[PDB]
Write a protein that binds this ligand. Structure first.
Ligand SMILES: [Mg+2]
Ligand SMILES: [Mg+2]
Ligand SMILES: [Mg+2]
Ligand SMILES: [Mg+2]
Ligand SMILES: [Mg+2]
Ligand SMILES: [Mg+2]
Ligand SMILES: [Mg+2]
Ligand SMILES: [Mg+2]
Ligand SMILES: [Mg+2]
Ligand SMILES: [Mg+2]
Ligand SMILES: [Mg+2]
Ligand SMILES: [Mg+2]
Ligand SMILES: [Mg+2]
Ligand SMILES: [Mg+2]
Ligand SMILES: [Mg+2]
Ligand SMILES: [Mg+2]
Ligand SMILES: [Mg+2]
Ligand SMILES: [Mg+2]
Lengths: 52, 187, 122, 52, 129, 52, 127, 147
RNA sequence: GAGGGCGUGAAACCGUUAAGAGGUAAACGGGUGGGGUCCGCGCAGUCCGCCCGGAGGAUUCAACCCGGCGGCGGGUCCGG
RNA sequence: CGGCUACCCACCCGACCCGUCUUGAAACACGGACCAAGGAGUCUAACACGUGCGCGAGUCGGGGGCUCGCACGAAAGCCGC
């Protein structure tokens, strides 16, 4: 039970990975190569209103 | 048999950079193309320093990067560093020089922009100088590393000045037999 | 950022079938199945592809607009050419040659259109 | 490093007149190996240990 | 006489024995896969004459004739219609091979699409009524 | 919550955006720019194979 | 999605409670859907089955137009038996066929005062 | 990572990376620091000189609390107060000088280095060195002792 | 071919059938030869994709322009 | 008609039964009747070196606190007088 299970990450690297993932979620080629169907979808990242 | 000589097949070299950084690989591609297509030994050495490891690229410092351009003949030249230029607490005045390095720290970039200099990246350095004209390549203090001060023939046999490993630098830790003549021998 | 997109997509994608042989892309807009950089339909700002028609007769050509990025509803403009194989082969030849639009992959578009016309005529 | 404008889509699908400037999070660099590193360490964090 | 692919030369293998393991004949607990012996007395490791031959780099076939079927194609395995249609560009050197877990109902559609796209399939007449 | 490269983040206390390694990173544009092609040797496409 | 932490999504514990549930729980488990005219007339979706309910079989080896009356409800075997559905043995003796009560369409219910109270609670909780 | 571990690579070799002749069994030489004077003197000596014996006085009940004196250098003496402060205080105004109180920063003793500009300041500390005090007198500052 | 320790049913071992062999105990590596099972093919008739000169039919573009939509490219950075 | 092939047989040549202790094994050195399953360099702490990443004269929240009661949430986000 005393195996080193949980691994701490630097908060700068955590925020770095969040920024990198949010940046890579903007390009159409990366998300299409991940496999989401963006054929009939309008413009990249979609902004919906506050009534949603 | 043909060769009576020993088979030392690969010499020493690191061909591809072990870092998986995509931007570093793009810089490796660009400066490899320039190093094999421009006949520029500056591009050769910068491509070798991009092949070089993270540890063997020591961080440059702001005072040294000032003093290497304070010398006569380095007024209008650009400082090219394969590595990081960091802040220094020591100096107070920063000249109007140009910087071409990777991953400059925030306080260093802020003080260079306050002083009026211009920082660049390696793609802009390549667009401004394919052969590398008007550039001075710099390197940092490798031998001032804490790891390199343990390295020698011994810790103490011709007294050897090379820092034996111990927990606490003080009394009662490795100070009696071989460190003074009153307790046994002395080095 | 096309080189960034290639250096990310060339591994760890929902493509790149590395199954017992070399790499195949299968790449829903493509001209050659080799997952290469010069033949790629999702990453480049200017892309050419040919596909079979939904009715069964003719070849449709999907070309990237370049008048607007990050908007995939209008990023691909399509045309439906149903000609007697030489008029449409010359049509795609003049469309690629007479424009600046992708001087590369001429023979990719031409060979795939000709092979799909041979697979379509019987 | 330019920040384009993205149209805001309504609940019907029509582009509204509201246009918000793209933030720099989507212009941040993309490091999938650092994403994979931090993702691996958080997956190691995300588990009950196992049977002893 | 089906498709007759492009120029493929005479294919040599430099030996065709798929080298047996030492003392696999004497004991039936030993599978006939190769396994490098690391004994200090073994005649096979010492490379005595009149013994079996160990697989080494010298038995490597030519890169032009590597992974080549005797028909002249290179095989690629296929599960469905889109993985058959990916071979539309290079059908004159690469043949299809339907997976074993594909039923007859989809297998007839795969072989019909292969006959339309002129892609060689290695097993066209298997698992039929 | 993250900001631009001009200002800091106003919600996170000690965070800034990462340093951008290659600013204008179109490698095809760089290699086909006239500033690079002004200083190239020659296109050497001879093979010089083995002569029996 | 399960939100209360006092109930299992656990397969072993659910199968344990299912195959070792007492008879009053097994009555709730062995419940049967209703015909469309009876649910239109009573506004109720599901009811437990009893000895004198008329049954149309919807699935199995025998399907449809078999409106018969059940005779036995083995809650140990989770099986009701229907008088109409028969099968002969080797020796010419008839025997009933195992039918699970979830594949059972009830066309007629047995009326009782307790069943009127049950139907009132069903209609009031459905609202 | 056991798939990156050398043990998975060495499956097939008989002695498994430790030789057939030497036969590393349990603990061949001893345990821990065994034989510090008898038979491992070429490892304890010649790699850790000074290891055996007593050296000096035995201060009973020692704390690393009374001798607390963090040393600040003359290079670190400036950036304890912001650069805007020293520029707007020494922009040719008058003979007034800003006060840098290192006890507020948490550093007690001021020591000497180089790189001390002409613009004088006032340093309040609990301790000083004569080199730093001469540097402050040379640049024209004032040395102030506080408790 | 699920018949009461009854899902799937391998190896060691045994029985029977079919084939082959049998003085240097059996077994093996290199090289062939013979036999048998099986596979692909049509066995003195199987190769294809393009161009041109010849013989009949059936169609309408293309060659040039008018009608029209969508994109490529630069200039006045004109109109914002 | 052609076919390499984990099928069988014959012929010429070579060929002692594997593993280890050993300077030396086919040994008149030891274990091994055969077959199926299990079976042997893992984990923690500490240190040193090499490598990759982030920040960089600073670095690190692992100790707690903040969010509404959420399956994945024993996760993750934030603290900065
Ligand atoms: Mg040789
Ligand atoms: Mg050698
Ligand atoms: Mg030996
Ligand atoms: Mg359980
Ligand atoms: Mg070895
Ligand atoms: Mg010994
Ligand atoms: Mg030893
Ligand atoms: Mg059984
Ligand atoms: Mg069975
Ligand atoms: Mg016989
Ligand atoms: Mg030995
Ligand atoms: Mg002996
Ligand atoms: Mg031996
Ligand atoms: Mg004996
Ligand atoms: Mg023995
Ligand atoms: Mg024995
Ligand atoms: Mg086993
Ligand atoms: Mg290190």
């Amino acid at each position: 039970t005393w195996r080193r299970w949980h691994r701490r990450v630097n908060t700068t690297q955590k925020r770095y990975a969040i920024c990198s993932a949010l940046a890579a979620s903007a390009l159409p080629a990366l998300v299409m190569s991940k496999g989401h169907r963006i054929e009939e979808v309008p413009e990249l990242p979609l902004v919906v209103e506050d009534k949603v | 048999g043909v060769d009576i000589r020993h088979n030392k097949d690969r010499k020493v070299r690191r061909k591809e950079p072990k870092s998986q950084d995509i931007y570093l690989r793009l810089l490796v591609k660009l400066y490899r193309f320039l190093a094999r297509r421009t006949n520029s030994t500056f591009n050769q050495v910068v491509l070798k320093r991009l092949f070089m490891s993270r540890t063997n690229r020591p961080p440059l410092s702001l005072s040294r990067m000032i003093r290497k351009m304070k010398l006569p003949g380095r007024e209008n030249k650009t400082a090219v560093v394969v590595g990081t230029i960091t802040d220094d607490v020591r100096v107070q005045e920063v000249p109007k020089l140009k910087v071409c390095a990777l991953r400059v720290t925030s306080r260093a970039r802020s003080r260079i922009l306050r002083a009026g200099g211009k920082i660049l990246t390696f793609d802009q350095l390549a667009l401004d100088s394919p052969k590398g004209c008007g550039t001075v390549l710099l390197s940092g203090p490798r031998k001032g590393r804490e790891v390199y001060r343990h390295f020698g023939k011994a810790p103490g046999t011709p007294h050897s000045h090379t820092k034996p490993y111990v927990r606490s630098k003080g009394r009662k830790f490795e100070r009696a037999r071989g460190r003074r003549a009153s307790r046994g021998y002395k080095n | 950022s096309a080189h960034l997109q290639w250096m990310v997509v060339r591994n760890c994608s929902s493509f790149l079938i590395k199954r017992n042989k070399q790499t195949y892309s299968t790449e829903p807009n493509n001209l050659k199945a080799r997952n290469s950089f010069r033949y790629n339909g999702l990453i480049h700002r200017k892309t050419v592809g040919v596909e079979p028609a939904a009715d069964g007769k003719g070849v449709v050509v999907v070309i990237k607009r370049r008048s607007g990025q990050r908007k995939p509803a209008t990023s691909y403009v399509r045309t439906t050419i149903n000609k007697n194989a030489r008029a449409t082969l010359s049509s795609i030849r003049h469309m690629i040659r007479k424009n600046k639009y992708r001087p590369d992959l001429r023979m990719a578009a031409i060979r795939r259109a000709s092979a799909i016309l041979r697979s379509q005529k019987p | 490093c330019a920040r384009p404008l993205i149209s805001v889509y309504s609940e019907k699908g029509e582009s509204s007149g509201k246009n918000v400037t793209l933030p720099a999070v989507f212009k941040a660099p993309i490091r999938p190996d650092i994403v994979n590193f931090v993702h691996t360490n958080l997956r190691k964090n995300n588990r009950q240990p196992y049977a002893v | 006489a089906a498709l007759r692919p492009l120029v493929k030369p005479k294919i040599v293998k430099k030996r065709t024995k798929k080298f047996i393991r030492h003392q696999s004949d004497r004991y039936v607990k030993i599978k006939r896969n190769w396994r490098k012996p690391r004994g200090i007395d073994n005649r096979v490791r010492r490379r005595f004459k009149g013994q079996i031959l160990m697989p080494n780099i010298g038995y490597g076939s030519n890169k032009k004739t590597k992974h080549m079927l005797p028909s002249g194609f290179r095989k690629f395995l296929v599960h469905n219609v889109k993985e058959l249609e990916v071979l539309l560009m290079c059908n004159k050197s690469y043949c299809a091979e339907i997976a074993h877990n594909v039923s007859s109902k989809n297998r007839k559609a795969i072989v019909e699409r292969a006959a339309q796209l002129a892609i060689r399939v290695t097993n066209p007449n298997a698992r039929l009524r | 919550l993250y900001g631009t490269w001009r200002k800091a983040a106003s919600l996170k206390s000690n965070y800034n955006l990462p340093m951008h390694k290659m600013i204008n990173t179109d490698l095809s544009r760089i290699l086909k720019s006239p500033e690079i092609q002004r200083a190239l040797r020659a296109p050497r496409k001879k093979i010089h194979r083995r002569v029996l | 999605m399960k939100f209360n932490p006092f109930v299992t999504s656990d397969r072993s514990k659910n199968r344990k409670r299912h195959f070792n549930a007492p008879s009053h729980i097994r009555r709730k488990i062995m419940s049967s859907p209703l015909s469309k005219e009876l649910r239109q007339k009573y506004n109720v979706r599901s009811m437990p089955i009893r000895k004198d309910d008329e049954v149309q079989v919807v699935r199995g080896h025998y399907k449809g137009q078999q409106i018969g009356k059940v005779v036995q409800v083995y809650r140990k075997k989770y099986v009701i038996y229907i008088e109409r559905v028969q099968r002969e043995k080797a020796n010419g003796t008839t025997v009933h066929v195992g039918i699970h009560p979830s594949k059972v369409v009830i066309t007629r219910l047995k009326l009782d005062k307790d069943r009127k109270k049950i139907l009132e609670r069903k209609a009031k909780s459905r609202q | 990572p056991s798939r990156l571990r050398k043990t998975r690579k060495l499956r097939g070799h008989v002695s498994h990376g430790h030789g057939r002749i030497g036969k590393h069994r349990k603990h061949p030489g001893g345990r821990g620091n065994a034989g510090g004077l008898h038979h491992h003197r070429i490892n304890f000596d010649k790699y850790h000189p000074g290891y055996f014996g007593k050296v000096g006085m035995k201060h009973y009940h020692l704390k690393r609390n009374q001798s607390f004196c963090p040393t600040v250098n003359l290079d670190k003496l400036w950036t304890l107060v912001s650069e805007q402060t020293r520029v707007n205080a020494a922009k040719n105004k008058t003979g007034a000088a800003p006060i840098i109180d290192v006890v507020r920063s948490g550093y007690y003793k001021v020591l000497g280095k180089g790189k001390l500009p002409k613009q004088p300041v006032i340093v309040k500390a609990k301790f000083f060195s004569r080199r730093a005090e001469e540097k402050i007198k040379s640049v024209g500052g004032a040395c102030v002792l506080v408790a």
